[PDB]
Amino acid sequence: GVNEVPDYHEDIHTYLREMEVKCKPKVGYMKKQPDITNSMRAILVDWLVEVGEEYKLQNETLHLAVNYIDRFLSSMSVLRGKLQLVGTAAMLLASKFEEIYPPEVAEFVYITDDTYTKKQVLRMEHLVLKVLAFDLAAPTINQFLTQYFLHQQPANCKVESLAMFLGELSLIDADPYLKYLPSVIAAAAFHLALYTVTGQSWPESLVQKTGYTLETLKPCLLDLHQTYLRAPQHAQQSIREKYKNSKYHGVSLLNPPETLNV
Amino acid sequence: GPGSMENFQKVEKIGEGTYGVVYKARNKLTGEVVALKKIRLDTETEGVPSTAIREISLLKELNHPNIVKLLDVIHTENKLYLVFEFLHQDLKKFMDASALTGIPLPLIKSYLFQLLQGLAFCHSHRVLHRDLKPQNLLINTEGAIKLADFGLARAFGVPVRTYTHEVVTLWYRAPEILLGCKYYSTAVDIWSLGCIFAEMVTRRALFPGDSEIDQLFRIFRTLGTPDEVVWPGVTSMPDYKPSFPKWARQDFSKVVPPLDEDGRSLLSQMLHYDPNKRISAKAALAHPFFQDVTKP
């Protein structure tokens, strides 16, 4: 029905595919950052997951923030001491865009354990808006997933939750996930979740919609599969903790499959 | 990116919102007349307002002849200036001042058809407007009408999730919002446009309620109190009550007597109770009502 906008979903899908190309970070940005590393970014993202949890923000908000951070760090060098300020400002902007009730600025200042002032958060907000030229309606992994979900036969909450989780995991590791578009990571996540829970594969119906096949998803699937297998060992664990919750059907507790069979 | 305030010359104030104030102004180099919307920041404490972040981010992507064009954004540390294309009037003012014996049908048809083009384009770019009302529809000298004021708009996902409740100015607000439904969608903008269609014919609001419950009641007295047959789920809605009076649906030719058969047909489909059955903007564009449409 109308909550799935039958008359517009294709138009919307085509538009998001165009926009994800416009909103894409520079794949190699991190080697051009003198004072920050993938490891530092992973720490920051994991912290944003926790902030999202502490304030009960939407997952979409989390994804927008990372998009904003990665696009910012694509043209602006930042010292390690300032990385969190960028992240904080990004989470604020994502919250004002996506949330019904965004946390107040003072709450963002509070979660940085008074590393920064309100003035600093607000100036950074302004700098981020300038750098992104207010281009904030970015496509996320989530925006594609929820559409892919409509192709399940029948709907399955464990599959949906597990796909969200795998997609979140990808936010953590700029290498390799910076090289993949939201729509492709989403496809890999949906296929891996579906296969893990039900044994089934990427449906032909989504080949029709997306033009992607298991062949085109194969590189991302292999990365995401390694990511899932190693997830208990990863230095960052906030996503695994979050997805143990019943709100997400405790999917972080599901065992990953040992092989994907091509 | 391109402008600075040095190149504009304010001409007169043309409006106000909770958003700040709107001026008419002239580009001194190109000659272009614009609307400047000022959003002060040093007054705010929480930084750049979310209404403004939504308006700018959404309007930067929506380039369409029936959406008011954002030309530019002057972002000082003291003020935020939004430069828009200028349109001399709104539909409300036109209805009150010049439409005293009516809006001729050719012009109603032209306006409605343009509004649907603009709204279809929004929905195709995953934007709900969420405040369509005559005050927010601007008209130029050439006969164009355009959607304005995207401060209450929102980028949606597919399928939708729960968004802000009690949106849309009350007279223009859809029954699913009034009954507290968990989800609403593109159908809420069609409802508003339906109310606006009717209002262009009569020059009075179709449902002028003074509270949520009074608004519901006025709608029920006009279209009939909905039941499970016209609207599956209705009796399970969070603010549905069994105590609701059960009004009969009246003949639609009594709702807007001067409207022809095609007009009635299209209006009924815009005001369908069930959001799933309400016509989409994209489908409404092919309604026979528009068969002879012009732009005067």
Side-chain angles (χ1 to χ4, degrees), chain B residues 7-26:
Chain B
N7 294 324
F8 299 95
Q9 175 66 70
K10 288 184 167 83
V11 176
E12 80 198 38
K13 183 178 179 180
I14 53 170
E16 208 183 22
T18 64
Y19 319 122
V21 40
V22 182
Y23 298 76
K24 174 185 186 177
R26 227 163 66 241

Side-chain angles (χ1 to χ4, degrees), chain B:
Chain B
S4 83
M5 295 317 296
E6 176 58 8
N7 294 324
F8 299 95
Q9 175 66 70
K10 288 184 167 83
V11 176
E12 80 198 38
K13 183 178 179 180
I14 53 170
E16 208 183 22
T18 64
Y19 319 122
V21 40
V22 182
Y23 298 76
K24 174 185 186 177
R26 227 163 66 241
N27 184 316
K28 289 199 283 186
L29 291 177
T30 70
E32 193 189 9
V33 175
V34 299
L36 299 174
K37 180 191 292 210
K38 179 150 108 286
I39 296 96
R40 207 168 332 254
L41 306 154
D42 219 310
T43 284
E44 295 302 320
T45 59
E46 302 307 283
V48 177
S50 60
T51 57
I53 282 155
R54 288 182 179 167
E55 184 157 40
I56 301 173
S57 62
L58 299 183
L59 275 184
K60 266 202 101 216
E61 302 191 359
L62 304 168
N63 308 113
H64 185 273
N66 301 105
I67 303 176
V68 180
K69 183 160 197 218
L70 188 56
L71 304 182
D72 207 352
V73 172
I74 289 123
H75 206 25
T76 299
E77 298 138 31
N78 64 34
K79 293 179 179 179
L80 192 36
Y81 281 101
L82 292 208
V83 188
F84 291 94
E85 183 178 2
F86 171 78
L87 292 93
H88 76 120
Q89 215 189 12
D90 73 56
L91 180 61
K92 156 56 58 157
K93 271 160 193 158
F94 173 68
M95 276 183 303
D96 294 331
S98 306
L100 312 167
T101 30
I103 306 189
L105 203 283
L107 198 50
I108 291 179
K109 195 173 298 207
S110 168
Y111 284 168
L112 185 56
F113 196 64
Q114 295 181 65
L115 293 174
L116 291 161
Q117 289 178 64
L119 187 60
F121 182 99
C122 290
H123 296 174
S124 294
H125 295 69
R126 55 71 173 111
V127 170
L128 299 178
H129 182 287
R130 304 195 301 173
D131 209 13
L132 296 164
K133 53 164 171 198
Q135 295 76 351
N136 282 343
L137 314 179
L138 305 175
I139 281 169
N140 73 15
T141 51
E142 289 298 312
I145 187 171
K146 314 199 180 199
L147 310 201
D149 196 355
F150 277 76
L152 306 112
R154 178 96 130 122
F156 63 97
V158 182
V160 297
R161 84 151 187 274
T162 301
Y163 309 126
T164 303
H165 172 36
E166 304 177 6
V167 283
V168 194
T169 303
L170 182 61
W171 298 347
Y172 301 94
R173 186 178 307 163
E176 59 270 33
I177 302 167
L178 286 166
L179 292 168
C181 289
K182 175 176 197 185
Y183 297 125
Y184 67 75
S185 197
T186 52
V188 312
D189 293 331
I190 286 294
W191 180 278
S192 302
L193 270 203
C195 296
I196 289 155
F197 177 20
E199 183 167 345
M200 281 194 283
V201 174
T202 71
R203 290 147 277 131
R204 69 179 191 170
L206 182 60
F207 302 126
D210 61 356
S211 54
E212 287 179 273
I213 195 61
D214 182 53
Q215 189 69 32
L216 267 178
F217 287 4
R218 284 158 185 279
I219 295 171
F220 291 178
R221 291 174 272 237
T222 296
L223 299 181
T225 301
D227 58 14
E228 287 291 337
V229 177
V230 61
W231 186 2
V234 71
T235 64
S236 290
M237 293 183 284
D239 304 318
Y240 179 89
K241 271 141 65 203
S243 73
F244 280 173
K246 281 164 163 40
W247 283 287
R249 174 167 185 103
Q250 70 190 146
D251 157 49
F252 214 78
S253 68
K254 295 289 170 282
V255 174
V256 184
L259 206 50
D260 59 78
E261 200 174 276
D262 289 340
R264 285 183 323 259
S265 162
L266 164 61
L267 182 64
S268 61
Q269 298 171 244
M270 297 174 81
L271 303 181
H272 208 292
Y273 274 116
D274 188 346
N276 296 326
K277 303 303 209 175
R278 201 174 296 154
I279 188 165
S280 78
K282 161 182 296 199
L285 287 174
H287 194 285
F289 181 71
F290 296 118
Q291 67 181 285
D292 52 1
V293 81
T294 89
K295 192 161 341 284

Side-chain angles (χ1 to χ4, degrees), chain A residues 36-99:
Chain A
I36 66 184
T37 61
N38 291 329
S39 163
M40 291 180 203
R41 179 189 167 286
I43 292 172
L44 166 74
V45 181
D46 187 80
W47 175 72
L48 292 177
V49 171
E50 256 180 348
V51 169
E53 284 313 87
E54 161 70 23
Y55 286 107
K56 298 229 294 296
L57 299 186
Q58 297 295 305
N59 293 346
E60 175 66 11
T61 303
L62 170 67
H63 278 82
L64 289 169
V66 176
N67 177 269
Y68 305 161
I69 291 163
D70 285 332
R71 275 167 44 205
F72 190 84
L73 294 181
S74 288
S75 73
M76 309 284 289
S77 314
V78 179
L79 291 183
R80 64 191 64 186
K82 289 300 195 294
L83 176 51
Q84 190 182 193
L85 180 55
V86 174
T88 301
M91 198 59 153
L92 175 65
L93 279 167
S95 296
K96 284 166 179 191
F97 184 87
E98 196 53 38
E99 298 289 327

